[PDB]
Symmetry: none
Subunit: 369 residues, 4 copies
């Protein structure tokens, strides 16, 4: 009941020589520098019914060389699973094993889609941890055929100080987007080239994400990704159709012009007029506002095209600034800003919810020429 050499070689091959339970590279010893095959081929169901996970109904003979029953493991993970059969049951190991092999198979069968710079931009203005994993962006990239020369750029804004999101805070945000990011992109010019693709995901203040989009909007190969509460960086549903984007035009008059975006949620009119008395409200919405609505990149593009029409319509109404009140997903805030890089050179005054002022909207950044 000994696994033969051919089967052991298949196990090493189908796992790419990494431990299926911890991911460590079993083909090399990085401490001393020698190539060495230090993994072990491990049986889920043992040959003896008295072994760990042993069961009589298992016919050892029939599965000695069955790779569905054989994992590549490091010595430590192998020792643990054999010392704790109840804690590493057959069904759980089999499920992890099949999931591991399937990730390899999908990687091997994905067409090459070129290089991109991974870019994560995140704030600290929430009262919870806010952290996008680098691995998840790289995995979403790979699923689309994109790879990177390095793990990329990850910018975390300084947290608000004791006065909240004050002038200092927004200066820091400006410096992070317009100076820190630019410096880190310059350091990648030699490895990625003059005009590289940018695989960008943000989870940060809405005004900050708009400023980010304005800063990078003139990059022709920007590839927007999205953090999703359920799916993390995985697109929820590549087949989903974008929603209708409904628009209500502003009333006539000379009051300040407000653009209200009700996409993540319905922005209450009372909160807009409280912050901007006399506002003339134009609203872009979807039928069922929802935090979950960024189902794929086509949704993002459909938002962009809907917005492009309405920004033209509003800029034709007035030379004065447009005041923005947005409950929108983070990926849509980036795309909003990218429309302002060149296509829409009007002044936009971005309002945002203010925890220091009982959730009222207050004016934050000015965007535009």
């Amino acid at each position: 009941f000994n696994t033969n050499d051919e089967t052991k070689r298949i196990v090493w091959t189908q796992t790419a020589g990494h431990c299926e339970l911890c991911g460590t590279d079993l083909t090399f010893d990085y401490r001393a520098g020698k190539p060495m095959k230090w993994g072990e081929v491990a049986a889920i169901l043992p040959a003896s019914p008295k072994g760990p996970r042993g069961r009589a109904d298992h016919d050892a003979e029939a599965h000695t060389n069955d790779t569905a029953n054989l994992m590549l493991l490091c010595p430590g993970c192998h020792d643990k699973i054999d010392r704790d059969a109840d804690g590493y049951p057959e069904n759980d190991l089999s499920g992890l094993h099949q999931a591991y092999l399937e990730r390899i198979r999908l990687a091997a069968t994905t067409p090459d889609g070129g290089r991109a710079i991974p870019l994560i931009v995140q704030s600290q203005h929430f009262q919870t941890i806010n952290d996008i994993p680098v691995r998840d962006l790289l995995t979403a990239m790979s699923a689309e055929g994109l790879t990177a020369f390095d793990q990329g750029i990850k910018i975390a804004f300084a947290a608000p100080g004791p006065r909240g999101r004050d002038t200092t805070y927004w200066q820091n945000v400006k410096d992070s987007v317009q100076y820190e990011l630019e410096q880190q992109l310059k350091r990648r010019g030699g490895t990625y080239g003059d005009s590289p693709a940018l695989a960008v995901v943000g989870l940060a203040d809405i005004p900050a994400l708009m400023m980010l989009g304005q800063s990078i909007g003139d990059r022709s190969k920007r590839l927007i990704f999205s953090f999703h509460r359920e799916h993390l960086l995985r697109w929820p549903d590549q087949s989903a159709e974008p929603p209708s984007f409904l628009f209500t035009p502003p009333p006539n008059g000379d009051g300040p012009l407000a653009l209200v975006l009700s996409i993540s949620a319905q922005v209450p009119v009372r909160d807009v007029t409280d912050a901007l008395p006399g506002a003339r409200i134009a609203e872009l919405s979807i039928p069922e506002p929802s935090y979950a609505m960024v189902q794929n990149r086509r949704v993002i593009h459909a938002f962009r095209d809907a917005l492009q029409i309405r920004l033209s319509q509003l800029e034709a109404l007035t030379p004065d600034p447009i005041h923005v009140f947005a409950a929108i997903p983070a990926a849509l805030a980036i795309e909003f800003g990218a429309l302002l890089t060149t296509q829409h050179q009007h002044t936009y005054l971005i309002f945002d919810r203010d925890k220091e002022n009982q959730d009222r909207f207050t004016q934050t950044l000015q965007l535009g020429p």
Copy 2:
């Protein structure tokens, strides 16, 4: 034209780093072995340099191809390609490597939070969370965090009490922030289960948020910390909006059971009741984590509607599973904050709903 010769050590390295697929068409070159036939490594694949011959083993630059793809590649007399494939080849190896290291993306912090009541009658040992974590690839590397909500002081569960609960949980959560590792230095995931009164669980959600790699687990009366049925579809979440009027706005969540309307109006005279329910309310309804996500999505769609109706507080009367209470609290951690007044039944006052927690302005 020519063929590139390699020794056997080089073939084994190349087969391993490519996982035995052709790098140009993706075909799995172990097909013979899968059919029960001998694996003829040297006949079902060709190994060639990714780049044309330069002016000057180097296994990192050798490609694994199927015979068909190899024959389609123009080659010089030494078996080098006439056109560069290094970009495609390096990208192939990077995609394999990223998949192969994916298990270290499961580095995780276990967190169990219970009330004193449930710690006394229904203690959840770390072993129960750890084995459920391990089954879905979440791997703890240090002792799990097991804490109880603090007993209230003389002022009861006032604003300061709840802020102290949040501070205490978030202090423990500094492990999630700081104990970075794996291939990329990512912060570890949080694996969290709660069993406590619904207001306390909402404050646990307030503490953890929903903008990090975080997996909620659920204690189930029959299945403990294992998910009852990973294939179960989430139920429909039904909603009835409130009647129009000036009375206080109440949101009733009838998910574990049907909350009787009279208990709500008794506790909140004049209440205008909106209700979120499922077709068959049940203590057992958290069949998998997708049920929790689906609850969140439906809830937020309706909270958007309710919050727009009035500036005044939403008064919450919830019969919901513990994991759903955590997600409810986590949902309300945006910058935007509407006022929510959470009621909970007092067993020592005839099970009457009493206001227990305020969220927002």
Copy 3:
């Protein structure tokens, strides 16, 4: 040639059940939660001369139960050392083995010194990485019997923006020290009690470390540690005698009063009068200014004692602010600030080298009342 159970028990004991080469806990499986002894007792010199590191002059019988030859290793580390004898030679393993055992013995014989909050404060104002390892502070704490309930507080200032250390930069520094730090200490109020000991090390802007010192100067049980270019967080020499702190009193006059601290290096008088024309210079120095001079905490105490006298004497000369020009180690910058909380309530205007003005001194923070 079979190591007996008594000796295996001693090996497990003297290593505290961790892998001597990677430090992993071999008494417990953290993934599934079962106590398990999954380590291996490993021989440096093998019983057979044909084994890894084997040699003919090794009397295996004589060393079967010789704990100098027996390491506790995890299965992975043990596999590697047996697969690459040239990369893990006998003398190198023996040295690592003995060093590991001595660290355990020293920890076990250290008298208890109570609990303390670990605090690391570091800037990003250098043109190189600046990063104090958490482990090294905890290890210096443990060498003095101090332990903590968590790995502690680590505050990293925001980097200077594109304008250098501007008003925004110093506002961020103030917020990091006066708000961020206080919030982090507040979260620990219950765990550590009311007036806990504070084990603090800084490597940050001199004016910022002085402000840090002022913020913690009224604390009881403040325990300053020091980052040293040779010894990291270890005190260089506990037996070293503190240097004499030489003092040159200021000239009589009506010009602005400057305190020059020449401890790390000699501050050139020319640079002080350039920044503050007509300065009346008082100077505190040591006989041989040196970056390495913080040999132990008694040196910091001696600096405090000297400053007590000299600040009193300068403060009696004028009601006007005192202008500070300091080339001093980071630990002494904290100590200087700590004297301003209650001992010396006078206005101090801190100058610092300005990389945006050709290394000239420019005024930065104002400290004191």
Copy 4:
């Protein structure tokens, strides 16, 4: 009065305490060390830390310390000891996990010239690292300086060198790990021209966990003698005068003063040397630290002496050139003008690098 334990409980408690009394620190394996049988149950007592099970709350005490503890009839303590017990276990744990503080990045930096005559392989740095407890987790970084363009090694060239080195390291320093999430240590060896090595030092600094290694003609990347004391460093102060201030470093060899005044007429020469200048003098890392300490003591004097640049003429080993560069990375910056020998222009010194404002 006595709490009783079986063998398995003893195994656990002895292991988590490393076999010392938690109250006085005495090593309770003394008998075994003397060659006598280990009498676990007689050289120590185990009792709960708290008045009143879980092996985590059982303490190991020597008989004397156990005798001084008031106990109830079941052997539980009357007074709580859990704080001292938990602190003791923490100190043991911190020591036992110290090997994971060795996570490290290998870095080999060479010039094309020295790569041709003396290529340093990663394997050699890794084995020296491993012997010191430094543990790489991925491929080592092996780089060489770019060739200059037509403007030579000017300000822009050296700034691009620094930027490329720091970028290369950034990727690895993000790979935090171990028990506390610390960034890995840098293990660096350089073999290139002295100016390039100083710029390597400028890139890495000296305010992080970083260990320099040294290539030695006899011992390669292994330290010649870990026990060797560092040499004394002999200082010649510069004469008074108006000429340009020169610092001559005669560490590898004695630099002839005439070669300096030829390159820099009128030079006021300060010198730092050792009693026996030698290519072999980097006997251990403490020699490098001692060089930095002596150097900075004198640089403090020289920088205070004049606002003008310090002109550097250095016969120093490669590892010391790196540390020279790293020393000059404070906010404070004095101008240094670095000279180097042009072996094909009759070994004449020529200015090749400026550090400072």
